[PDB]
Design a protein around this ligand. Structure first.
Ligand code: MYR
Ligand code: MYR
Ligand code: MYR
Ligand code: MYR
Ligand code: MYR
Ligand code: MYR
Lengths: 115, 115, 115, 115, 115, 115
């Protein structure tokens, strides 16, 4: 229906604060958390993966390489899955952009220890 | 009232499975998650700490040393906070006892790197 | 209600004899044994600890360091728990003051064998 | 009449648990605590000695050597005084037999330091 | 009821001036001095300790280490007890934040002469 | 009118206890705290100085040297300002005389480090 699950009380507060973009006027809302869950199940991917910091990582991994080959439907996903994942880990970005940079750098560190 | 928050969908499934004791017949229920939250706020500790793997650790830290000096009210807490914490981390114990051993050993490892 | 439990027949006799203070005119009474039990349960500490020489020691241990930081509510406790403990051990002080000195010295002896 | 005195709240719980024998179906009850007190006063020995871990030791000392020369009336005493004494000291035997072994061994240790 | 006691005439003037926060619009009022006194007595700590520069120090000492383990109820306390203490000592901060820094540095100085 | 200000709740208790003289039967009362405040303002000195341990010192400093050249009106002042000051500092004298000795000795110590 429209209840909490993916994000807890504390996460919800920050979530509503985070904005979809750095230079916008539309904060994040449950509409985005559910909008992704629906598109997820469509790709044979349960929405529960978003409720777990581990499940999200698995999703971003498939969408990562499918960022250029993927379509708009995939783009939006990476946006939500990003801001959400950051919440489950620790990163408390203000927008969806900052979340992309953080996750982008974290991957660059592993490159040195996984080349 | 009586909804989800501390434990997500996936965590809820396992939670209901976990038993309060190894040799008992009373599985875990929301009644225990809320019963603790109430006692928490009483000690100037918000119940939200339980909804976060980080908050729980902070609680178990105070109850740890207060296991002998503390009263029954504290004992029950360590029981719930344990099974719950294990869920947020990764440990999927079957009872409350196993959760105590796991958390007990994890602390023994740090002793070698923090003596 | 108002029966015996913490102190036996023999202990009761001495208890009623012991005075709350060295220079006073108000001997000890069950009112003080129960008055403490109530404040104990409030701190998550069962009143039964007073019925056992072992339980008392555990209480005085927490109130010991909380003698300066603690409030008046704690002071009164240390007073009763003292006269009572002395009864369960062996010390048969006449007032609450003497009980403080006895327990104070006993701790000084361990300091030499636990520094 | 039929109230508490010799055994406190905590001791009462364990007392009712302890059985008169290892292979029996008759747990301990106040009937046994009073039954002994009556026989005690008969031997010029106050029943209060049972309410004190010190008094009990004095009793078991006289009945110890009078275990063979004594009659059945003495046997029953050593049985109750045993389970009771163990409670006041620390030993939490399950039956009256275990209590005899514990007290029997404790005496063997002194033999090495008192021969 | 609602009279003066903790803060004198001169202290009252400055108190009303001091703000709860550096970037806010809600100055300090008796409501905060009493709000703390109530929470104090709850922790077995008399409210009079706030009326004395010595009593405050004793309070901040317990709340100091309980800043992370403590709950929101404790946070607010450290806020009021801070601005108040500064008044009794000499520090005339403008907000509650400045008071935290002053007391924080003062403790750093002792570290060099108490390590 | 006739309320508290210079002395807090705790100070008031001790104040009422302190006596104007060592061998008298007239304890201290608000009448003396106000009686001085009135004479203070007369000398271009605000009564608030008495509500502050710092203000008092400034007063005793002027009356100190004016103890012989001053009149009876000044004598009474030094008496009240003394017992009061001792309260704000720490000294808990029983009479006004003891307060004079304490403050007299404290000044003798500085003489060695300020000759
Ligand atoms: C929002 O309310 C979340 C619930 C998701 C819809 C559940 C639909 C009801 C479940 C039982 C229907 C299955 C029919 C056999
Ligand atoms: C269970 O339903 C969880 C909700 C917790 C109780 C909230 C009570 C309602 C909130 C507003 C009342 C405050 C009055 C100004
Ligand atoms: C004094 O008489 C000591 C007894 C303590 C009060 C016990 C109250 C009665 C116990 C049963 C009531 C519980 C209701 C289900
Ligand atoms: C059980 O109720 C324990 C009480 C023991 C019996 C006491 C009998 C009453 C005491 C006063 C009677 C003495 C006659 C002068
Ligand atoms: C505000 O007016 C501060 C006063 C605090 C309340 C005091 C209540 C009255 C004191 C006597 C009542 C005790 C009943 C025996
Ligand atoms: C005792 O009640 C202390 C109060 C001191 C007297 C104050 C007098 C009232 C203040 C306003 C009057 C000024 C006239 C413009």
């Amino acid at each position: 229906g429209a209840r909490a699950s993916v994000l807890s009380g504390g996460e919800l507060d920050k979530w509503e604060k985070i904005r979809l973009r750095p230079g916008g006027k539309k904060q994040y809302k449950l509409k985005h958390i559910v909008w992704a869950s629906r598109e997820l199940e469509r790709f044979a991917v349960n929405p529960g993966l978003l409720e777990t910091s581990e499940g999200c990582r698995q999703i971003l991994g498939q969408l990562q390489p499918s960022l250029q080959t993927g379509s708009e439907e995939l783009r939006s996903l990476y946006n939500t899955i990003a801001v959400l994942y950051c919440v489950h880990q620790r990163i408390d970005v203000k927008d969806t952009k900052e979340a992309l940079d953080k996750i982008e750098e974290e991957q660059n560190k592993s490159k040195k220890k996984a080349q």
